[PDB]
Structure formats: C-alpha cells, structure tokens
Amino acid sequence: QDKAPSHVPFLLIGGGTAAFAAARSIRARDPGARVLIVSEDPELPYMRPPLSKELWFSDDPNVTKTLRFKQWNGKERSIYFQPPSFYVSAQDLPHIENGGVAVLTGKKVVQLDVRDNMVKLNDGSQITYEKCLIATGGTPRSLSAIDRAGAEVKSRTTLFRKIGDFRSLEKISREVKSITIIGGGFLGSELACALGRKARALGTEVIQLFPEKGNMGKILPEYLSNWTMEKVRREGVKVMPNAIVQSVGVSSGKLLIKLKDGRKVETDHIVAAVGLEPNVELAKTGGLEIDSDFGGFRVNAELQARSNIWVAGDAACFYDIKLGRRRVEHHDHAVVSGRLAGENMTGAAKPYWHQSMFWSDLGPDVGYEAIGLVDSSLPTVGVFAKATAQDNPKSATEQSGTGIRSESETESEASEITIPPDYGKGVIFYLRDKVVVGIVLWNIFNRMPIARKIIKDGEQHEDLNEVAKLFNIH
Ligand SMILES: Cc1cc2nc3c(=O)[nH]c(=O)nc-3n(C[C@H](O)[C@H](O)[C@H](O)COP(=O)(O)OP(=O)(O)OC[C@H]3O[C@@H](n4cnc5c(N)ncnc54)[C@H](O)[C@@H]3O)c2cc1C
C-alpha cells in the first residue's frame, strides 16, 4: 500500500518521458537526491513511440502482456524506461540511505498551491515540495462529431495515447471486421499501417479518412503527401482524403459516419487521431500563466513557471530560439527539456536552446524526420533521389542499435557544413525569404546535425539543389 510522504525535495508531476528524464538528470547531478514522481496512470514511466509502431509488428501473442517489443533489427527492448526494481518505495523515500526515485502510480495531482509549495492528490493526501516539475503532457482531442453523438458512439471510439489504448485497440483489431481511423497525421498514418498489416492476415478492413488531400497534408508538400497516401494504400488501407465528418451515429449495430460530400462510411470501431490538448488543469489552482494561442504552461528560457516550478515536455509552451513561443509533441523535446529541467533544479541555470527533432516510421521501410517550422502552406523546395538499400528505418536501427531515432541522431548541430564539389528519399526545405526555417527528411538518416546547422545559421541559400548534396541527394 504505497503511502505518500508528507514532503519531498523534488516533486515531478506526471510520470512520462519528461519526468523520467528529469529524474535521471537530478540523480546524476545529486547522487543523494530524493525524487518523487506522481503518476495518474497505473504503469511506471514508459516511452510512447513503440505503441503505434514496433509493438504491432510481432508474431508473439505474449507481447501485449510483457510490452517487450522487437526493434526493426530483431533485438528486444522494454517499453519501460528502467526495470521496476531500480525505483524505491514512496514510504522509504524520505530517509532511505543515499535517496532514490519513487513513483506513486494511480494518483493524480488535483491541486497546486504555489505560495504554500504544496499539492493535493485525488485521495486528499497533501505533499509539500522544495522544487517541482510539471510534466503532465497532453490529453487527446476528440472530434466534435463524436462528442455530440452520445455515449454509444463514444464507447466505440479510441483516443490513442497509452498502454491501455494499445491493448484495447489490438484486441478490437482481432475481433471486428472494420476499423476507421480519423486523422491524416503521423500518428493516424502509423496506426493505419500497423492495423492494415494485421488486417491482411485476418482478411479485414481498415479505413483512414481526413480532410486534407493526402496524408500529413498540413506538413508535407503535395508530392510526398500523395506518395505517403499511395504507400498506405499499398498496405491494404482504404484511404479517403477530402473527407469532412458531419456526424457519426449507430445504425443496425454499426457505426455510420456521414461525410459532408455525401459519402457514408459503415465501420465497427473508430480511432480518432486528431491532435493533443496540453494538460493544464493545474494552472487554475496554481495561478500559472497558460498560452491561449499555442496551449501549455508559459515558461521562461530556463523552463521556469515560478522560481521553484519548472515545466517540460508536451505541457510546456517554451520560447523556441528560432520560432518564438511554441509547443511541440516530440519525444526528443520531452527528453531534452526534462533533462534540462533536472539540471536547472540542481543549479545548472542554463537556457533551453535545443532545436527539437521529430521522427515517424511507417513500418521498417519508410521513415521521416522533421525539424523547425514545417507547414505545407509555406513555400517549399523538395529535392529527391532513388533510395539506396540503407535508406530506411530498419537499416538505421541495424546501424545504430536503436529504434528511438532521437537517440541515434544525437542532439547536436554539425560544427561546420561544406557543400561537396522512382524516388524513394529526399529533403524538403521550408522557406521564409530564401532562409530555411524547417526541414523534412524522407528516408535520410544520421544527417539531423546538418539540418540543425542549416536552420540555426539562418543564411539565405541561392541554390538548394547544392545544399541537398549535404544530405547525399544528387
Ligand atoms: C502513440 C504515440 C506515438 C508517438 N510516437 C512518437 C514518435 O515516433 N516520435 C516522436 O518524436 N514523438 C512521438 N510521440 C510523442 C512523444 O511520445 C511525446 O511527445 C512524449 O510522450 C511527451 O512526454 P511527456 O512526459 O511530456 O508527456 P507524457 O509522456 O504524456 O506524460 C505525462 C504523464 O503525466 C500524467 N499526468 C497528467 N496529469 C497528471 C496529474 N495532474 N497528476 C498526475 N499525473 C498526471 C499523464 O497520465 C501521463 O502519464 C508519440 C506519442 C504517442 C502517444
């Protein structure tokens, strides 16, 4: 019966990626530190990317119990950041010799009293802190057509975010004839591909619909958005672009989605993958400033919301050194900003100047990376080439030993860049006035430090075909 201590020097609210990175950082710099993670979920801290990717590519019926997945290179890894025995119990935390990290699982912080340096849990427990990190992440947006459809439809809609969602949806995948994914972004498309692969064996149907002309249409320019839609269609998924959902109802036991254009889609289950809402409930009681335009808790350069409260990960609205106020949903960001928060809580006093990278794999054969401002409404220049046999996530994993792309790319920008004297890979430059403000890499790995350097420098480029040569495109 894990009992909450009355006081902890370091209190981390939320037990996700950013919390874990902070906990690691605090203990590295203060080897006797006493750190408590308070986590709403019943599980110990775990990474999210495998939930839409490697966990679905497995013959092992046992993997939904163990959550020990095989990477694209065949090697097993646990979804948990560390073995459960590396944590100490919450009750031992205040006086165990040499300190430790405890996690109170199944407990939610429902009140933050910043002037009293205290939080209240859902069970009424009160805990004081010396330093606090808010790392509450986000909650999935629902579709208003689902929200207004009643309990029956809502009960047959998954918002895909946690271990529990993976297990429920994997079970649904084996039991029903038709599943529809609403949303064309990277998560929607990853699940389309995962579900489509399962459906081929089973002889069942997977549909993906969304309002854009093609997959990832808000990010990717037409050529690659269209190319991705073709790749998902090659997995056996019925992809419906230009689809605006008017309503969803139940008809003769099936869900019936009505689209504005007049088409109607019958299906057994819906997965909504339509973005995230930063979890800022605590800002009310806390009196903490939130950003109305981008969402999230506002923080300064050191990730502080208050002299002794920091924010990291998806819940933070930070000042991007290039782009201004910003919020992101990037594993890399959660790790680096968590880590930095931990350092600043142990006296580093350093600013968040990192340029956060994103990646997505649609299976072992197709991958993407992105950095900076990537928006398909911006002017773009794409340079493409035929793929070599090494230009895919599987080969990147083989080479690096990891499927967590942000781990293998490193965090740094290249020290210098010197341009040297059908398509299946390329680089997309997003432009403002000949300056590169964002880059998408399609099946190009180990070049993120070059992309970070190009954006950081912020020079004008006369010829992006020359710059593409840095990405081994020519
Ligand atoms: C399925 C999936 C696939 C993804 N794939 C990729 C990828 O391939 N590449 C990439 O760059 N990014 C990916 N992401 C994004 C990345 O995983 C997130 O950016 C990252 O998890 C953010 O970490 P975090 O610590 O900010 O938030 P989270 O990991 O969401 O953790 C916040 C935790 O705090 C808990 N919590 C919230 N409020 C409270 C409270 N009041 N009290 C107690 N606990 C609370 C929440 O339940 C949650 O467990 C993926 C996300 C998902 C869901």
Give the 3-state DSSP-derived string for the chain, with helices as H, strands as E and coil as C. Answer: CCCCCCEEEEEEECCCHHHHHHHHHHHHHCCCCEEEEEECCCCCCECCHHHHCHHHCCCCCCHHHHCEEECCCCCEEECECCCHHHCCCCCCCCCCCCCEEEEEECCCEEEEECCCCEEEECCCCEEEEEEEEECCCEEECCCHHHHCCCHHHHHCEEECCCHHHHHHHHHHHHHCCEEEEECCCHHHHHHHHHHHHHHHHHCCEEEEECCCCCCCCCCCCHHHHHHHHHHHHHCCCEEECCCCEEEEEEECCEEEEEECCCCEEEECEEEECCCEEECCCHHHHHCCCECCCCCCEECCCCCEEECCEEECHHHEEEEECCCEEECCCCHHHHHHHHHHHHHHHCCCCCCCCCCCEEEEECCCCCEEEEEECCCCCCCEEEEEECCCCCCCHHHHHHHHCCCCHHHHCCCCCCCCCCCCCCCCEEEEEEEECCEEEEEEEECCCCCHHHHHHHHHHCCECCCHHHHHHHHCCC
* Cα–Cα distances in angstroms (integers) from residue 277 to residues 107, 144, 295, 364, in the given order: 20, 14, 7, 30
Q: Has domain 5-45+88-137+279-352 been given CATH number 2.170.150.70?
A: no
Strand 380-385 relative to strand 367-372: parallel, antiparallel, unpaired?
Answer: unpaired
Name 190's Cβ contacts closer than 8 Å, sequence gap at least 6: 52, 53, 360, 361, 362
Architecture of domain 358-474: 2-Layer Sandwich (3.30)
Q: Which amino acid is at 177?
A: K
Q: Which of 67, 295, 274 is nearest to 162 (CA)?
A: 67
* CA atoms of 256 and 165, how far apart (whole Å): 22
Instruction: Tell me where in the chain the CATH 3.50.50.60 domain(s) lie.
Output: 5-45+88-137+279-352, 48-80+141-273
Q: Is residue 354 part of an annotated ligand binding site? A: no
Measured from the CB, is residue 403 less than 6 Å from ligand 1? no
Pocket test for ligand 1, best of 2, 13, 17 (most atoms within 8 A of CB): 17
Measured from the CB, is residue 52 less than 6 Å from ligand 1? yes
Per-residue tokens: 267: 């299906």
Instruction: Tell me where in the chain the CATH 3.30.390.30 domain(s) lie.
Output: 358-474
User: CB of 423 within 8 A of CB of 386?
Assistant: yes
Per-residue tokens: 326: 């910003």
Distance 48 CA to ligand 1 centre (A): 7
| 361 phi-psi bin (left φ>0, alpha ψ -120 to 50, beta other) | beta
Nearest-atom number in ligand 1 for the CA of 359 is 9
* CA atoms of 123 and 160, how far apart (whole Å): 27
Architecture of domain 48-80+141-273: 3-Layer(bba) Sandwich (3.50)
* CA atoms of 296 and 460, how far apart (whole Å): 33
User: CB of 423 within 8 A of CB of 366?
Assistant: no
Q: Is residue 388 part of an annotated ligand binding site? A: no
Per-residue tokens: 222: 């037409």
Nearest CA to ligand 1 atom 16: 331
Return phi, psi of residue 24, to 5°: -55, -45
* CA atoms of 237 and 189, how far apart (whole Å): 10
User: CB of 316 within 8 A of CB of 303?
Assistant: yes
* CA atoms of 231 and 399, how far apart (whole Å): 24
Kindly report the CA angle at 354 between 352 and 358, in degrees rounded to 5?
Answer: 130
Strand 316-320 relative to strand 138-140: parallel, antiparallel, unpaired?
Answer: unpaired
Measured from the CB, is residue 14 less than 6 Å from ligand 1? yes
Q: Is residue 112 part of an annotated ligand binding site? A: no
* CA atoms of 144 and 155, how far apart (whole Å): 15
* CA atoms of 331 and 202, how far apart (whole Å): 32
User: CB of 180 within 8 A of CB of 267?
Assistant: yes
Query: Cα 69 to chain center, whole Å?
Result: 18
Distance 334 CA to ligand 1 centre (A): 8
Return phi, psi of residue 22, to 5°: -65, -45
Method: X-ray
* CA atoms of 444 and 33, how far apart (whole Å): 41
In the Cβ-directed half-sphere of 384, how many Cα atoms lie within 13 Å? 12
Return phi, psi of residue 111, to 5°: -150, 140
Q: Is residue 190 part of an annotated ligand binding site? A: no
* CA atoms of 139 and 240, how far apart (whole Å): 26
Q: Which amino acid is at 113?
A: D
Angle (deg, nearest 10), helices 331-345 and 17-29: 30
Nearest CA to ligand 1 atom 20: 331
Pocket test for ligand 1, best of 20, 38, 40, 317 (most atoms within 8 A of CB): 40
* CA atoms of 11 and 131, how far apart (whole Å): 6
Q: Is residue 108 part of an annotated ligand binding site? A: no
Per-residue tokens: 11: 């209190």
Q: Is residue 16 part of an annotated ligand binding site? A: yes
Name 12's Cβ contacts closer than 8 Å, sequence gap at least 6: 19, 22, 23, 35, 36, 37, 38, 132, 133, 135
